[PDB]
C-alpha cells in the first residue's frame, strides 16, 4: 500500500502535503 494522498499524489497541495508529511513524520 501507499497512503491516502501524501503518497498517492492526488491533485492539490503536493508541496505542503509533502513538507508536513515527511517533516511531521
Domains in the chain: how many in total? 1
Which domain, by its residues, includes 2?
1-25
Query: Radius of gyration of the chain from Cα atoms?
Result: 8
| CA dihedral sign of residues 5, 11, 19, 24 | negative
d(CA 1, CA 13): 21
5 with 21: CB under 8 angstroms? no
Q: How was it solved?
A: NMR
Place of cell 500500500: 1
d(CA 22, CA 2): 14
The H or E element containing residue 20 is helix 14-24
Q: Which residues contact 12 (CB under 8 A, 6 or more apart)?
A: 5
Amino acid at each position: 500500500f501507499l497512503x491516502k494522498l501524501x503518497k498517492a499524489x492526488f491533485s492539490x497541495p503536493k508541496x505542503l502535503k509533502x513538507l508536513l508529511x515527511r517533516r511531521x513524520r
